[PDB]
Each structure stands twice: as structure tokens, then as C-alpha cells.
Amino acid sequence: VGINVKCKHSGQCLKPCKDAGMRFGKCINGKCDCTPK
């Protein structure tokens, strides 16, 4: 789930999610959400 970054796509979020300790990314309300383990 969520990190603390602003995304445009579910990629824009995937990179920081993964990079922050997650698996994938999903953008919700302009902010990021992750799809972790």
C-alpha cells in the first residue's frame, strides 16, 4: 500500500514502491499505493 509520493501512472508508483521495499505500484488519488508481498 501507499508510500509518500505523487504519481501519474501505476508505474510512477511502482518504481518508488519497489525501491521503498514493495513489489508493484498503483496510483490512486494522485498519490501512490503499492502491491507489496
**Residue 31, strand partner residues:** 6
Domain count, the chain: 1
Instruction: Fill in the amino acid letter for 36.
Output: P
**Please, which residues have CB within 8 angstroms of residue 19's CB and are 6 or more apart in sequence?**
none
Q: Which of 13, 12, 11 is nearest to 2 (CA)?
A: 13
- Structural domain for 5, as ranges: 1-37
Q: What is the dihedral of CA 24, 33, 9, 20, to 10 degrees?
A: -60
Asked whether the beta carbons of 16 and 10 are under 8 A apart, the reply is: no
Cα 13 to Cα 36: distance, rounded to the nearest angstrom: 12
**Please, which residues have CB within 8 angstroms of residue 24's CB and are 6 or more apart in sequence?**
10, 14, 17, 18, 34, 35
The CATH number for 28's domain is 3.30.30
Q: Which residue, chain included where needed, has cell 502491491? A: 35
Q: Which of 37, 36, 2 is nearest to 13 (CA)?
A: 2
DSSP-derived secondary structure for 12-37: TTHHHHHHHT-S-EEE-SSBEEE---
